[PDB]
Design an enzyme around this catalytic site. Structure first.
Site, PDB file in Angstrom:
ATOM      1  N   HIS A  76       0.606  -3.671  -7.545  1.00 52.07           N
ATOM      2  CA  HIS A  76      -0.378  -2.873  -6.831  1.00 52.07           C
ATOM      3  C   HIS A  76      -1.697  -2.996  -7.574  1.00 52.07           C
ATOM      4  O   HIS A  76      -1.884  -2.353  -8.608  1.00 52.07           O
ATOM      5  CB  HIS A  76       0.056  -1.424  -6.730  1.00 52.07           C
ATOM      6  CG  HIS A  76      -0.845  -0.596  -5.875  1.00 52.07           C
ATOM      7  ND1 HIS A  76      -1.942   0.068  -6.378  1.00 52.07           N
ATOM      8  CD2 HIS A  76      -0.819  -0.334  -4.548  1.00 52.07           C
ATOM      9  CE1 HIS A  76      -2.554   0.707  -5.397  1.00 52.07           C
ATOM     10  NE2 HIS A  76      -1.892   0.479  -4.277  1.00 52.07           N
ATOM     11  N   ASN A  94      -2.781   6.695  -6.769  1.00 55.67           N
ATOM     12  CA  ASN A  94      -3.377   7.245  -5.558  1.00 55.67           C
ATOM     13  C   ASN A  94      -2.718   8.559  -5.163  1.00 55.67           C
ATOM     14  O   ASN A  94      -3.358   9.405  -4.526  1.00 55.67           O
ATOM     15  CB  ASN A  94      -3.281   6.231  -4.424  1.00 55.67           C
ATOM     16  CG  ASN A  94      -1.915   5.601  -4.331  1.00 55.67           C
ATOM     17  OD1 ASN A  94      -1.763   4.515  -3.781  1.00 55.67           O
ATOM     18  ND2 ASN A  94      -0.911   6.279  -4.867  1.00 55.67           N
ATOM     19  N   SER A 105       0.826  -1.200   0.000  1.00 56.22           N
ATOM     20  CA  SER A 105       0.000   0.000   0.000  1.00 56.22           C
ATOM     21  C   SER A 105       0.864   1.255   0.000  1.00 56.22           C
ATOM     22  O   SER A 105       0.785   2.075  -0.919  1.00 56.22           O
ATOM     23  CB  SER A 105      -0.925   0.003   1.218  1.00 56.22           C
ATOM     24  OG  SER A 105      -0.184   0.241   2.404  1.00 56.22           O
ATOM     25  N   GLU A 159       0.208  -1.762 -11.319  1.00 53.61           N
ATOM     26  CA  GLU A 159       1.425  -0.978 -11.197  1.00 53.61           C
ATOM     27  C   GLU A 159       2.580  -1.911 -10.892  1.00 53.61           C
ATOM     28  O   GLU A 159       2.458  -2.790 -10.038  1.00 53.61           O
ATOM     29  CB  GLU A 159       1.292   0.064 -10.092  1.00 53.61           C
ATOM     30  CG  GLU A 159       0.349   1.197 -10.416  1.00 53.61           C
ATOM     31  CD  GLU A 159       0.810   2.509  -9.826  1.00 53.61           C
ATOM     32  OE1 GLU A 159       1.974   2.884 -10.062  1.00 53.61           O
ATOM     33  OE2 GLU A 159       0.011   3.168  -9.127  1.00 53.61           O
TER      34      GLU A 159
END
Lengths: 436, 710, 436
Positions: free
Chosen positions: B446, B496, B425, B458
């Site tokens: 990811h 993100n 994360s 990713e």
């Protein structure tokens, strides 16, 4: 070597035995309900391959068999190969020898493997007593064949004109022998009467079998032999056998109605194994093949024997006949036999069997052998309980005994185990295992 | 041979001719300019001979029948005149093909897309193989265009109005069985007899003697065509928000074709290419198409890959089930799950089961292959069985020491060939590696939540990462039907990282006394699918918000959200759909309609002020935040190439495709010009709207990130 | 290295095949109407012992398999012994492998008595399409099991509440593959389309087979290995196969609408085996045992092989894969093969197979062998007709083919016969016969 026959291959290598596996057993309604017999074998085979280091290309043939049989997919071993992830070049194969089916599967794989045609195989059995094939009446099948072959419309009505009575009702399955009409338990009642087995002489065997089995789970000694079945609803997994009831007192089930006789029925439901569902499998492999791909063998195989007896009185004496033959083939003696095992499909019959192997007269006249085959110590007999506890899936209880016995001899650090079983139709099987 | 083109004639002993279409170059069978010329010569040479009785078209290529028109040819157009010329010439070519009296049959195998059905709809009869690769459709509205010729009028008159307009609008796909059922294709045959199966159909006497009837004849006429057009137009404009051109034009051209005749339809469609080929949306969509094709072609790395047949997963719950489903059902690779608890494995298997058998309930599949697909997913609570896994994925909680412990123990209990990946994360990849005997084989993927909806992943190498590892991971991600992106290992990564300012400024809006409904509607009307708050709640409030402290500690306080308000919801059991209570009415007691937000969120917010800010202005501010963050991160080469960043932004977040992405948007809006007004925004609100230095330089001196060709 | 598997016991005695016998076959719903397959097996094995004049105590094991299994008698090999006059200590058991069960039965009997466990055994098979195990729907059976386990009287009504009108209808039997959904014919149709088999040459094959079979019956050459069945009504005995239509013309063949692919298919009823009922059996015995009790061996056994292939495309290429392995094991060549015999499930699959054993490319890439197997001369191919004539009782075909092959080789010099068969599930079997 007037009686001993070695079980060696043409190259001189012994028939090693590699890992096995067992789906946890369940009663006929609790779990596995509606789950066919094929996919249980699919589960056990697929996750047995996905547990060791063997690539799937080594396996060259698998043999299953099932007693309760579904009309679709007669050769269930082919669907085991096709459905799971396996090389589609494996010689799938199915046998059927009643309650000793797994023993016959192992024997077939062993003899074919020592013939030289195969180098590694899978042998096992799956069984489910919850998807019973409920056939229609025999009369309402010729009518169907005729109407299929019927040509004109007016012929079909004239054909169904004979449709009458209760031919529409389905026919429940029958467990009684085809040629005898004996319910496979009432052939144990008369055995108990003949050899004098008391309802107190038994019903202590059932207690000592529920113990040493509840204790076996609590100790977790049988952790590496049992899968953790996952069911397509996926509501919750099944990890432990639910048939086992290792908490009842021996004075609790002494108060039960007789099952078959209902007048002098010294055998009842509690001291008789119930119909269950399950599966089991074992990987057979020659010693050279196991060695050259780096795998430690979980024991070996020594000898085996199959026998038949007349199905009109006491047909359940199969182990009594089979055991001396297996011993003489292995060049062994009952004295030098660390741990034994019995199918114990019923209370009594097993006790009758011990009494018979202990009796000199039986081996004197019914076998022609000079001396009796020996008596069995309680401690060296069903150490981890028996089928009056786990359950009795007809085609699966074979391989379960081999796996458990090999592991137990692994704990004791040596010895020669022995496994016997009796089957319907007066068929008995026995084999001698050697855990190095 | 540079003159033969592809269309080659061959007359067999029978009085029929077979035409093969083999392009000397690309494995696809595309349409170029010179074909439209030389096919006229071929058809004239065929028209001279009166001995013939039928003609058949054959792909003569294992891949496809005809891929479609070459987009690069359209890319060279300069005004409406060239597009109208192409439209008219295609129209006349198809009319000429349809003008023959003898029987013309198309034998379809492989793929038939774009202009392909043109040829198919220009032939009296057509047959297709049963190979599950065969497919029919018009994928041209996706490129912001419309079919070349007649497809807007001959197809509706052939198969029906409703299905034809649904095909033209959605641009869906047809299978052989359903094409046969619908009536588009006359016959379906196995591939082996394919051409032979066409021949007797050529020998049949009737080119068109009795057209098949339409059971949906009820609406034929003017009694209901106007009503249907009105309803479908309202439906589309509500669904597409009316910012997509080449949608109402389709309705207009179909209407004029049906009402005023085929000639009027041809003229209208010529005009349709006249303008629609030059609308900025068209260039945006063509460019994004090119970018996607290039990234699919791109091999990620340059070293040869490694064998890949065994995949392991360390963790269950919900996400691990998602990775398992993607790896097994899609890519067809055996997958083994490890967990500390049988409940976790059971829950993951249940997720994979529920995801499947929904096709079974819709008859899109049957249990025969459903069981086969499930056969590839196995579960265990022990390390035995992992000794030959090619690749493993770590998908459990992100305690750094916990991840280090697992990577150590899997190094102990597996092969040296095996490579390790982590669904990290926020923890740095190099930091996760740390104590590794083989750090060069440690990488980080990811995914998102869920994994069967968002289509890109990713790939996050650290300093020591062998190129074989990157190549293998990229090939695996491709095999899973995902778009891989290689990024520089920096705190917060890319996607993100730029998503955070979006939700942050959304909350900053929400706190200053504005009704959430109209700002949500304004920002989805700008072009973004799904509004801010619903995205935020369903994506995982804690999961997404967990990185905000990491971003703050990495770069600055611009990422900081208003305090005590988001955490107030956080420690309030109002944790989105997974907790069953958040923002929107999750009870769904309003007859499964658009349930409004919960009538309790507003009081817990300060909500002082009014609307104040204009409806376009809020969307402009949010997108300016994303643009500034994107340019700032691409300044330090967090993204390998500008195309990679553009495709990621448009294709994983939900940037409006018709805008093309961030950088198309920059070049569109006067580039540095917007900086001016953007500076004003800062002077109104705060330093959060400071311009990026690279942005300052490029805009002030006058530049584009994309020199390329212009 | 030298890949030859000599089928010899420990002492070196090769396997002999002393005698065999076959019940004449019949169409579905004909003379053998309502006769369970177990009864057919009873008939054939009992009368085979009657002719064989050997003491019944010599036989030590029998193995019959059967497709379309009936739920009443799972292990039919046991009831075969129990109902007839064989010695009860006989150790019988059952197998099941698609349409090649008899091949497998012979194979494992041979390998078992090669292992040394027994000295003489009986292998065969029996099946009957006259009686079908038509069962009730799957949903209904679960309700019956639950209501059997139901404990509350008022619970039974709450359990029967769940019902449907279509759940009462019996489920017709299925022949399509369990895991594929394709019937045997559909695979034949796509195979014919692929390799290219015109209807004219398929019908030519069928006509040739029928003419040869009728000629063989009229010559009476197949008289010493066919019973004269007697049926319990005892109205009139069955002496000859009723399937053979030896008075037919190719023009009659050409007038058949295709069966499976009603558009372009090139298989019909005339060029495909019908549903027949029958049985067959063979007595295996090591040559030492035969010599000891004074018997002339009706040939020998040389090699065998079983193979599996993928089920999705070309499921019926079993003979093509199996034959080269059998020849390699026997140390032979297709050139030195006096007679060849192949199972004719369909005309299309037969022609495709012969085409493939001549295909150099196929054996070069699909099998990995250097050269193609060989060319199947029409003169020595199916000398006495084939299954497109007599019929397909599923299980009995392998034993039947063995009997006629041995007899025909006896009618000429020694030679080396060869028998192959494909089977459902992509299973193929082949074996090589010596006949001195």
């Amino acid at each position: 070597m007037g009686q001993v026959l070695p079980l060696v291959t043409r190259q001189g290598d012994r028939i090693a035995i590699v890992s096995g596996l067992r789906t946890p057993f369940a009663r006929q309604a609790t779990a596995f309900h509606g789950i066919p017999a094929v996919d249980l074998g699919k589960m056990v085979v697929g996750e047995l391959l996905a547990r060791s280091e063997i690539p799937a290309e080594v396996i060259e043939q698998l043999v299953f068999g099932q007693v309760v049989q579904m009309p679709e997919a007669p050769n269930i071993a082919r669907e085991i190969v096709l459905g799971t992830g396996m090389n589609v070049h494996t010689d799938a194969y199915s046998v059927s020898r009643a309650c000793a089916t797994s023993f016959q599967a192992v024997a077939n794989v062993a003899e074919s493997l020592m013939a030289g045609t195969i180098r590694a195989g899978i042998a096992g059995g799956a069984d489910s007593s919850s998807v019973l094939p409920i056939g229609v009446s025999k009369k309402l099948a010729r009518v169907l064949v005729d109407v299929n072959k019927a040509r004109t419309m007016s012929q079909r009505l004239k054909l169904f004109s004979r449709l009458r009575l209760r031919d529409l009702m389905p026919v429940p399955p029958a467990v009684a022998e085809y040629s005898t009409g004996l319910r496979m338990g009432d052939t144990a009642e008369q055995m108990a009467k003949t050899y004098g087995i008391t309802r107190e002489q038994q019903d202590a065997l059932a207690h000592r079998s529920h113990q040493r089995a509840a204790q076996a789970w609590s100790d977790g000694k049988l952790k590496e032999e049992v899968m953790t079945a996952f069911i397509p609803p996926y509501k919750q997994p099944l990890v432990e056998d639910n048939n086992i009831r290792g908490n009842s007192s021996l004075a609790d089930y002494a108060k039960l109605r007789p099952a078959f006789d209902r007048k002098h029925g010294t055998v009842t439901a509690a001291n008789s194994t119930p119909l269950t569902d399950g599966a089991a499998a074992v990987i057979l492999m020659t010693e050279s093949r196991a060695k050259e791909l780096g795998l430690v063998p979980l024991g070996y195989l020594r000898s085996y024997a199959f026998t038949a007896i007349d199905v009109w009185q006491d047909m359940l004496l199969g182990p009594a006949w089979s055991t001396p033959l297996a011993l003489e083939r292995a060049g062994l003696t009952m004295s030098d036999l660390t741990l034994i095992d019995m199918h114990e499909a019923f209370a009594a019959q097993t006790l009758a069997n011990i009494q018979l192997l202990g009796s000199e007269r039986f081996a004197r006249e019914a076998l022609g052998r000079a001396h009796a085959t020996g008596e069995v110590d309680d401690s060296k007999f069903n150490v981890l309980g028996g089928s009056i506890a786990y359950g009795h899936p007809f085609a699966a209880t074979g391989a379960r005994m081999i796996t458990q016995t090999l592991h137990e001899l692994r704990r004791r650090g040596g010895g020669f185990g022995l496994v016997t079983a009796c089957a319907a139709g007066g068929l008995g099987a026995a084999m001698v295992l050697e855990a190095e | 041979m540079e003159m033969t083109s592809a269309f080659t004639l061959n007359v067999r002993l029978d009085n029929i001719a077979v035409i093969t279409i083999d392009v000397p170059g690309e494995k696809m069978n595309t349409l170029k300019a010179e074909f439209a010329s030389q096919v006229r010569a071929i058809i004239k040479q065929l028209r001279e001979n009166k001995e013939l009785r039928g003609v058949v078209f054959v792909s003569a290529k294992p891949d496809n029948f005809i891929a479609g028109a070459d987009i690069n040819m359209i890319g060279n157009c300069k005004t409406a005149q060239e597009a109208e010329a192409l439209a008219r010439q295609g129209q006349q070519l198809m009319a000429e093909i349809h003008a023959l009296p003898i029987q013309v049959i198309a034998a379809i195998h492989g793929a038939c897309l774009g202009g392909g059905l043109e040829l198919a709809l220009a032939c009296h009869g057509r047959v297709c193989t049963d190979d599950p690769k065969t497919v029919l459709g018009l994928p041209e509205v996706q490129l912001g265009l419309l079919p070349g010729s007649g497809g807007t009028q001959r197809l509706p008159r052939l198969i029906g109005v409703s299905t034809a307009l649904e095909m033209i609008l959605t641009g869906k796909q047809l299978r052989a069985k359903q094409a046969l059922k619908l009536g588009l294709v006359d016959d379906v045959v196995p591939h082996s007899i394919l051409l032979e199966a066409a021949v007797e159909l050529a020998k049949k006497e009737r080119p068109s003697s009795r057209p098949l009837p339409v059971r949906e004849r009820i609406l034929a006429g003017p009694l209901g065509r106007a009503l249907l057009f009105k309803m479908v137009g309202k439906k589309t404009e509500h669904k597409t928000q009316g910012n997509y051109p080449a949608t109402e034009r389709i309705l207009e051209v179909v209407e004029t074709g049906l009402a005023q005749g085929t000639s009027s339809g041809y003229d209208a469609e010529a005009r349709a290419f006249g303008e629609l080929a030059m609308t900025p949306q068209s260039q945006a969509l063509r460019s994004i198409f090119f970018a996607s094709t290039d990234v699919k072609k791109d091999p990620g790395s340059d070293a040869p890959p490694a064998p890949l047949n065994s995949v392991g997963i360390l963790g269950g719950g919900l996400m691990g089930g998602g990775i398992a489903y993607v790896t097994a059902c899609k890519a067809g690779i055996p997958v083994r799950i490890k967990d500390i608890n049988p409940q976790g494995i059971n829950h993951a298997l249940k997720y994979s089961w529920d995801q499947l058998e929904g096709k079974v309930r819709r008859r899109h599949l049957k249990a025969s292959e459903r069981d086969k697909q499930l056969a590839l997913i196995s579960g265990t609570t022990d390390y035995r069985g992992f000794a030959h896994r090619d690749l493993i994925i770590e998908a459990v909680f992100e305690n750094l020491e916990l991840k280090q412990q697992m990577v150590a123990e899997v190094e102990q209990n597996c092969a040296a060939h095996t490579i390790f990946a982590s669904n990290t994360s926020s923890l740095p990849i190099g930091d996760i590696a740390a104590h590794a005997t083989r750090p060069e084989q440690v990488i980080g993927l990811h995914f998102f939540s869920p994994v069967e909806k968002m289509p890109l992943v990713e790939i996050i190498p650290h300093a020591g990462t062998s190129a074989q590892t990157i190549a293998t991971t990229v090939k695996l991600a491709k095999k899973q039907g995902k778009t891989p992106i290689v990024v520089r290992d920096k705190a917060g990564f890319y996607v993100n990282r730029i998503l955070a300012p979006y939700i942050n400024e959304a909350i900053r809006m929400l706190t200053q006394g504005e009704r959430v409904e109209h700002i949500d509607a304004a920002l989805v009307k700008f072009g973004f699918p799904v509004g801010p708050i619903q995205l935020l709640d369903e994506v995982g409030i804690d999961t997404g918000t967990k990185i905000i402290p990491v971003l703050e500690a990495a770069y600055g306080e611009r990422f900081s959200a208003p305090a005590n308000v988001v955490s107030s919801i956080l420690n309030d059991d109002r944790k989105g759909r997974k907790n069953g209570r958040g923002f929107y009415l999750y009870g769904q007691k309003g007859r499964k309609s658009k349930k409004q937000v919960d009538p309790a969120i507003y009081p817990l917010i300060g909500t002082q002020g009014q609307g104040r800010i204009s409806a376009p202005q809020v969307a402009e501010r949010c997108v300016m935040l994303m643009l500034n963050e994107a340019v700032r991160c691409v300044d330090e080469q967090v993204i390998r190439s500008v195309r990679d960043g553009d495709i990621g932004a448009v294709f994983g977040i939900g940037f409006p495709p018709f805008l093309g992405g961030p950088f198309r948007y920059i070049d569109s809006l006067g580039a540095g010009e917007v900086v001016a007004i953007m500076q004003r925004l800062a002077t109104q609100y705060g330093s959060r709207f400071t311009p990026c230095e690279r942005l300052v330089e490029m805009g002030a001196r006058g530049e584009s990130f994309w020199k390329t060709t212009a």
